[PDB]
Amino acid sequence: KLVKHPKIRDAYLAQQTPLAWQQITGSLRTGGTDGVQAHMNTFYYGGVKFVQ
Amino acid sequence: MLTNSEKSRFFLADLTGEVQSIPNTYGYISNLGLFRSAPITQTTFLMDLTDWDVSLLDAVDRDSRKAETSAPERVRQISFPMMYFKEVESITPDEIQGVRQPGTANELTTEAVVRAKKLMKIRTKFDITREFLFMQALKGKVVDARGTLYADLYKQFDVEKKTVYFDLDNPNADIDASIEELRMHMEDEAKTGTVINGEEIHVVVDRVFFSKLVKHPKIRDAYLAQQTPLAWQQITGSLRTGGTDGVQAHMNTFYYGGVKFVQYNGKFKDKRGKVHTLVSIDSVAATVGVGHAFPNVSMLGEANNIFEVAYGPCPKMGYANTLGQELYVFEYEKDRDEGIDFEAHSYMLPYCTRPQLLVDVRADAK
Amino acid sequence: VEKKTVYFDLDNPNADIDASIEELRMHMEDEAKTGTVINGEEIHVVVDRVFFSKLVKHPKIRDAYLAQQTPLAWQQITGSLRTGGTDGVQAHMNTFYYGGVKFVQ
Amino acid sequence: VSLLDAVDRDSRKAETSAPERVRQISFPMMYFKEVESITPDEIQGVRQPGTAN
Amino acid sequence: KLVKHPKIRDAYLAQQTPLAWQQITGSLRTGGTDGVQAHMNTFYYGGVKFVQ
Amino acid sequence: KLVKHPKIRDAYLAQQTPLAWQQITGSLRTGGTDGVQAHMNTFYYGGVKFVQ
Amino acid sequence: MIKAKTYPDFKEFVKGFIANVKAGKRYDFRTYQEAILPLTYSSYWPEADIAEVEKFDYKPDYKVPFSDDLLYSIGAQMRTSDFFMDLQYAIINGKDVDTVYCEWLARVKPFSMLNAKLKDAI
């Protein structure tokens, strides 16, 4: 639900930097292993980072 | 070179040769190299399955001095049959007695040309059958074109199948949710005991699914708003940048969410007359988009290969317990120089060891 | 054999040009029956002046290129399209690129 | 061509394929011709367009 | 209210400088310290500097 | 009249190039000398060069 | 007053706009177009609140509609606010709208290739 919100989607679409392209159309799986999967979904907004 | 005219035997006209039409063959999966070759010397083979599980631990009072214990593991065994294919062909003198060669004026046919043509046809037929069988195995059930059921992996190994709905028709539907669902399924249902990266998977879809995915407003606007070569290439460039199947030099490809989508148009005709589309899913109208997803070879490495092909020996003398070969071809001479007859044999079965990793994709929603 | 005609419907803003181009490519690749690997993007396309004018004005084609900050996009809109080979009269011929297909007037 | 059907190993059945087809056609051709001639009176005392004498 | 106004947001979103990206999707807590927190919110616009 | 046309203006408005910046926001006086004026107005479009 | 983010799609936003205009309401936002239009045609429309206007003292100098059955000649480019002003002016003059051609349009502001198909009201 967090990623679908218009205020995030449109802000990152307007921004044009490698981070912006990766998060909107790239793969968000950049975190370290959790013991089962090689990577964990991660999202950056404001100063906080979210982990699933 | 000159031949008789159209409406007179006393006048000549010039012949310029022939033009040939050859049917299409696809053989896409056969070239990926997913299926390893595992020849065997028997008509059947076995496997062993081992399972165990763990659960949380419950606290106990210190003075009671009671404890818990874990149940033992379960061992099981299975077996497989194999499919046999055969066909026959013959050459007789009446095929070369006075029969003109299509591309010439007064040159007669010979045994060598007919031999070569018929052998090439046999090889083409066997290649087509191999491709169809590989695709059927990838679907999860191995069934002959006639419809006979030979292997049912989801029952051989006690496990179910998963389907993912994309809902591409709905303008507001989100695709990243379905992609993440697929990734988590592949990462969780392996139970290989090691770290797994679900980002390594093939996703093969049909024409309608590809068009619906490409033309969805959410994908199109997102890729249109970005200034990067990938965005430029997909939106206004050519999407045909994949490998070569048996017909076309490039397969439609699309990139989104780190997943790579490929469009496969392969289809064959049964001798009953009906058409067997390779990417279709059983008992679903062709108007709905459909695809199949399966892991890459590197997702687990050669140490834990998942796809295999078995080859058995020929029934004829001198091959009682030999290792087995992909194709056998034999020739014999007819009685009192009457002609020649050929034979081609095959004996194989493709299978999968972890069928729960095969996921089907649909464009509709339920 | 039966001839095939491909309709682009350039006067309808909602028309899908990509569908027509894909139809053309599929026809080329499937109806050859040559028994060899065939690339459907290696085709000449000769069009009339009216066809060129209608194609260039289509909202989809114009907007897609106007949204791109690449040298090709600038040249094809605010530049000159006479980059083709010599004609018997003209020193250059109109050329337009879209979807990997090259149109010549 | 067409797909094959499964055959059991211990009964020795088989399958066969149909033959091919041939056909022929013809074409006429087109002919062109034109004529010209040169006569001395066309050159006798004719001034060259770009010069005086 | 100020950081949310449509005009300010659109004006900063139409830019492509590092400052524009930071103020819209980054963390504004780049200010000095007070007695309770290390950094105070800060915003730049029209040459004036706002601190919460 | 030519300069104001919506199509001519729009074509250059969205283009990131020094020529586009100069022709839309800069001065169009970049020609030669007519004997009365130091520079003459000029404009580029479609490969043609218009002069006043 | 059209409240912010009241529609999920431009396709429904235009329907709401036409329905409101047929009720005698008038709108004019040429002077602050930048702060109303969202980024794309698939975002939530409108970005900010739009208030009615008391008067509609507006008349394009160029001919409007281009023809009986088309607001603008195919491929015409116009300022986004001007499109809404011109469609409103046409509707005021008895015309009715069938559909708005915005399927493949990419950019929303400051210029857009929007167009409309007109008919006669009853």
GROMACS .gro file of C-alpha atoms in nm, chain B residues 32 84 213 237 252 260 265 333:
model
    8
   84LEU     CA    1   1.763  -2.288  -2.400
  136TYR     CA    2   0.802  -4.482  -2.701
  265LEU     CA    3   0.083  -0.575  -2.037
  289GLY     CA    4   1.197   0.187  -3.018
  304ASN     CA    5   0.938  -0.969  -2.830
  312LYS     CA    6   1.181  -1.016  -1.826
  317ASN     CA    7   0.425  -1.789  -3.080
  385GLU     CA    8   1.637  -5.421  -4.816
   0.00000   0.00000   0.00000
